[PDB]
Design an enzyme around this catalytic site. Structure first.
Site, PDB file in Angstrom:
ATOM      1  CG  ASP A 186      -1.894   1.051   1.253  1.00  0.00           C
ATOM      2  OD1 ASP A 186      -1.888   1.892   0.334  1.00  0.00           O
ATOM      3  OD2 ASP A 186      -2.714   1.063   2.184  1.00  0.00           O
ATOM      4  CB  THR A 187       2.210   3.481  -2.711  1.00  0.00           C
ATOM      5  OG1 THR A 187       1.020   3.653  -3.496  1.00  0.00           O
ATOM      6  CG2 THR A 187       3.087   2.385  -3.339  1.00  0.00           C
ATOM      7  N   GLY A 188      -0.179   4.187  -0.414  1.00  0.00           N
ATOM      8  CA  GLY A 188      -0.942   5.287   0.158  1.00  0.00           C
ATOM      9  C   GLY A 188      -1.010   5.226   1.677  1.00  0.00           C
TER      10      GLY A 188
HETATM   11  C1  LIG Z   1     -10.167  -6.659   2.941  1.00  0.00           C
HETATM   12  C2  LIG Z   1     -11.142  -6.169   1.917  1.00  0.00           C
HETATM   13  C3  LIG Z   1     -12.274  -5.470   2.620  1.00  0.00           C
HETATM   14  C4  LIG Z   1     -10.450  -5.246   0.935  1.00  0.00           C
HETATM   15  N1  LIG Z   1     -11.073  -4.352   0.185  1.00  0.00           N
HETATM   16  C5  LIG Z   1     -10.343  -3.615  -0.635  1.00  0.00           C
HETATM   17  C6  LIG Z   1     -10.958  -2.553  -1.550  1.00  0.00           C
HETATM   18  N2  LIG Z   1     -11.240  -1.335  -0.804  1.00  0.00           N
HETATM   19  C7  LIG Z   1     -12.380  -1.278   0.069  1.00  0.00           C
HETATM   20  C8  LIG Z   1     -10.325  -0.162  -0.941  1.00  0.00           C
HETATM   21  O1  LIG Z   1      -9.349  -0.232  -1.686  1.00  0.00           O
HETATM   22  N3  LIG Z   1     -10.589   1.079  -0.176  1.00  0.00           N
HETATM   23  C9  LIG Z   1      -9.683   2.237  -0.271  1.00  0.00           C
HETATM   24  C10 LIG Z   1      -8.863   2.196   1.037  1.00  0.00           C
HETATM   25  O2  LIG Z   1      -9.194   2.901   1.985  1.00  0.00           O
HETATM   26  N4  LIG Z   1      -7.708   1.276   1.132  1.00  0.00           N
HETATM   27  C11 LIG Z   1      -6.794   1.093   2.384  1.00  0.00           C
HETATM   28  C12 LIG Z   1      -6.647  -0.457   2.780  1.00  0.00           C
HETATM   29  C13 LIG Z   1      -8.019  -0.897   3.241  1.00  0.00           C
HETATM   30  C14 LIG Z   1      -8.872  -1.554   2.351  1.00  0.00           C
HETATM   31  C15 LIG Z   1     -10.133  -1.950   2.775  1.00  0.00           C
HETATM   32  C16 LIG Z   1     -10.532  -1.676   4.084  1.00  0.00           C
HETATM   33  C17 LIG Z   1      -9.687  -1.021   4.973  1.00  0.00           C
HETATM   34  C18 LIG Z   1      -8.418  -0.626   4.548  1.00  0.00           C
HETATM   35  C19 LIG Z   1      -5.356   1.850   2.427  1.00  0.00           C
HETATM   36  C20 LIG Z   1      -5.323   3.127   1.612  1.00  0.00           C
HETATM   37  O3  LIG Z   1      -4.116   3.227   0.965  1.00  0.00           O
HETATM   38  C21 LIG Z   1      -5.454   4.379   2.496  1.00  0.00           C
HETATM   39  C22 LIG Z   1      -5.450   5.624   1.637  1.00  0.00           C
HETATM   40  C23 LIG Z   1      -5.829   6.846   2.489  1.00  0.00           C
HETATM   41  C24 LIG Z   1      -4.813   7.668   2.979  1.00  0.00           C
HETATM   42  C25 LIG Z   1      -5.140   8.782   3.749  1.00  0.00           C
HETATM   43  C26 LIG Z   1      -6.474   9.076   4.029  1.00  0.00           C
HETATM   44  C27 LIG Z   1      -7.488   8.260   3.537  1.00  0.00           C
HETATM   45  C28 LIG Z   1      -7.158   7.140   2.767  1.00  0.00           C
HETATM   46  N5  LIG Z   1      -4.348   4.431   3.431  1.00  0.00           N
HETATM   47  C29 LIG Z   1      -4.774   4.728   4.790  1.00  0.00           C
HETATM   48  O4  LIG Z   1      -5.937   4.559   5.135  1.00  0.00           O
HETATM   49  O5  LIG Z   1      -3.786   4.920   5.751  1.00  0.00           O
HETATM   50  C30 LIG Z   1      -3.929   4.456   7.067  1.00  0.00           C
HETATM   51  C31 LIG Z   1      -2.666   4.897   7.751  1.00  0.00           C
HETATM   52  C32 LIG Z   1      -1.547   4.115   8.003  1.00  0.00           C
HETATM   53  N6  LIG Z   1      -0.575   4.761   8.591  1.00  0.00           N
HETATM   54  C33 LIG Z   1      -0.764   6.036   8.855  1.00  0.00           C
HETATM   55  S1  LIG Z   1      -2.339   6.522   8.307  1.00  0.00           S
HETATM   56  C34 LIG Z   1     -10.487   3.497  -0.537  1.00  0.00           C
HETATM   57  C35 LIG Z   1      -9.570   4.698  -0.606  1.00  0.00           C
HETATM   58  C36 LIG Z   1     -11.246   3.402  -1.823  1.00  0.00           C
HETATM   59  C37 LIG Z   1      -8.985  -3.900  -0.576  1.00  0.00           C
HETATM   60  S2  LIG Z   1      -8.742  -5.200   0.606  1.00  0.00           S
END
Ligand SMILES: CC(C)c1nc(CN(C)C(=O)N[C@H](C(=O)N[C@@H](Cc2ccccc2)C[C@H](O)[C@H](Cc2ccccc2)NC(=O)OCc2cncs2)C(C)C)cs1
Lengths: 99, 99
Positions: free
Chosen positions: B25-27
């Site tokens: 996760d680069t974000g």
């Molecule tokens: C397990 C199953 C439910 C999964 N679903 C998915 C598909 N989904 C929902 C996503 O990609 N959803 C994205 C997301 O939040 N991805 C996340 C991994 C994740 C996936 C699902 C559920 C919980 C966490 C990870 C993303 O890189 C986000 C991006 C971001 C950054 C700043 C502010 C807001 C958002 N990164 C963060 O949330 O950072 C958390 C932090 C870590 N350290 C310091 S802050 C949205 C932005 C669209 C992947 S795995």
């Protein structure tokens, strides 16, 4: 070119006529932008992440310039804390992770 | 290696003796794992995501193997749908984004 991960990989995008900064995010399936107006039809959706879920509007076939290159895809719009470019647009630019 | 982004970039990790799946996760600034037992003391940390903030446990100097490579660093443990490898550990492997 090569983008380092020592800092957040933030790039300039152009969408809906507006210039914005957004985070290149391999952990996001989809692209999510801070609330704004976009042309065309949309449907409501709930998207989940670390803090829980937020309600967004899904616009399809929206054109976006990233790194000057023009791509097209789905853009979700709502109360996100930062603009996120997801895999759905990153693939269109040929982005890969390498080590 | 090179990883494209048409599907989620999920890799195998090994932490505290156990094989698990995690999302590259680069974000994400930091690495966040689903609840599990880790050795030593922890300290409190609040992290923000799309849905808002959540309390997690911060464990420092934890060894993880990612793609068989050993990294040692900070790991955050708390409520998450998926294990997430953030930039803190991706940089130890020398990951870059390329196009
Ligand atoms: C397990 C199953 C439910 C999964 N679903 C998915 C598909 N989904 C929902 C996503 O990609 N959803 C994205 C997301 O939040 N991805 C996340 C991994 C994740 C996936 C699902 C559920 C919980 C966490 C990870 C993303 O890189 C986000 C991006 C971001 C950054 C700043 C502010 C807001 C958002 N990164 C963060 O949330 O950072 C958390 C932090 C870590 N350290 C310091 S802050 C949205 C932005 C669209 C992947 S795995």
């Amino acid at each position: 070119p090569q983008i380092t991960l020592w800092q957040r990989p933030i790039v300039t995008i152009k969408v809906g006529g507006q210039l914005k900064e957004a985070l290149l995010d391999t952990g996001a399936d989809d692209t999510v932008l801070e609330d704004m107006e976009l042309p065309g039809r949309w449907k409501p959706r709930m998207i989940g992440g670390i803090g829980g879920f937020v309600k967004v509007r899904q616009y399809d076939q929206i054109p976006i310039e990233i790194c000057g290159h023009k791509v097209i895809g789905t853009v979700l719009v709502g109360p996100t804390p930062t603009n996120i470019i997801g895999r759905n647009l990153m693939t269109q630019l040929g982005f890969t992770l390498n080590f």
